[PDB]
């Protein structure tokens, strides 16, 4: 089920795409090859939405959300924001976040129940995550790395971390998650696992340079075969 996909001669996937259980966000830049690749995958089941966030092709690092909600930063323009609201149904919640940093896919990683955040986030966004996403919030670093989304990929299946994560840290964090963890490489040695690939409960999409041992790791810990 694991599908290698490339966007504009770049192996990075979570940079330009945002994947939940119930929708997918794609960029508008370059060509429709990357969008048709998800259409081959996702199809008519979940809506796949072309979007920019403050005029960017980069949207998965800009956005952090679950099946129930989607958080966008302050700089999101209301033309884009109204297009997202007309695009996504009532079951998905959208709200701009008035905070210092803008990149959310680096700073908030989550699933439908548990979110790890930046441990030095403001308290208002820490409120808003458990309000909109309806998830449990934990201030945590994955192996002392304060960016928690690019270094740790989550679903309701399981979780994947970068290889510098200690096994003590994996158990320390999976007790909070209640889903298992594996130190994994992606895109041939790139430690950035959250932007190198996206995952939801039935699909994991990664770059072309993600090797077959790495695909076996993802296919095991996120259970891509039924």
């Amino acid at each position: 089920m694991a599908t290698r996909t490339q966007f504009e001669n770049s192996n990075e996937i979570g940079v330009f795409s945002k994947l939940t259980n119930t929708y997918c966000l794609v960029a508008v830049g370059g060509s429709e090859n990357f969008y048709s690749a998800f259409e081959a995958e996702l199809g008519d089941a979940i809506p796949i939405v072309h979007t920019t966030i403050a005029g960017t092709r980069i949207i998965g690092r800009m956005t952090a959300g679950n099946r129930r909600g989607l958080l966008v930063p302050t700089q999101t323009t209301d033309q884009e924001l109204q297009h997202l609201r007309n695009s996504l149904p009532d079951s998905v919640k959208i709200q701009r976040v008035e905070e210092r940093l803008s990149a959310l896919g680096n700073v908030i990683c989550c699933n439908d129940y548990v979110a790890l955040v930046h441990p030095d986030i403001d308290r208002e966004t820490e409120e808003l995550i458990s309000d909109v996403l309806g998830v449990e919030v934990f201030r945590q670093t994955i192996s002392g790395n304060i960016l928690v989304g690019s270094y740790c990929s989550l679903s309701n299946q399981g979780g994947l971390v970068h290889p510098q994560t200690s096994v003590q840290d994996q158990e320390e964090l999976s007790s909070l998650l209640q889903v298992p963890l594996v130190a994994g490489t992606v895109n041939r040695g790139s430690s950035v696992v959250g932007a190198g690939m996206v995952v939801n409960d039935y699909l994991a999409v990664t770059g072309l340079d993600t090797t077959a041992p790495e695909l076996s790791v993802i296919e095991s810990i996120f259970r891509l075969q039924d």
Binding site: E12, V15, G55, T56, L101, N106, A195
Partner: protein, 122 residues
């Protein structure tokens, strides 16, 4: 906003304090002009102070803060508080795990890995 011979900050957590640009990669060739770096530019930069292991060696570095007012495509003239760059490979893959301070939107659009290690965009 930065010509050849410009001290800029170090916004990653690698250990360098300041980055001294000695060459600009991908600049034009006109007599008596200076190769000028700006936002979203990978230039050769030397470390002046910090860890001596990062000192005495040039590294490629992408500039994330410029502090000279540019014209963005949407109508705004804007500039950061200071000059800042982050050192990386020529492949654009970051050395630092977390990049502190605001990172430019064009620069994060240019490099996927810098945006992967960007905490603050603009």
């Amino acid at each position: 906003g930065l010509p050849v011979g410009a001290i800029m900050n170090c916004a990653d957590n690698s250990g360098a304090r300041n980055l001294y640009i000695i060459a600009v990669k991908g600049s034009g060739s006109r007599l008596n002009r200076l190769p000028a770096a700006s936002l979203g530019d990978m230039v050769m930069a030397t470390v002046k102070k910090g860890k001596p292991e990062l000192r005495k060696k040039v590294m490629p570095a992408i500039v994330v803060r410029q502090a000279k007012s540019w014209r963005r495509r949407d109508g705004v003239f804007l500039y950061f508080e200071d000059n800042a760059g982050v050192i990386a490979n020529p492949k654009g893959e970051m050395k630092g795990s977390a990049i502190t301070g605001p990172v430019g939107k064009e620069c994060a659009d240019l490099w996927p890995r810098v945006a992967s290690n960007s905490g603050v965009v603009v």
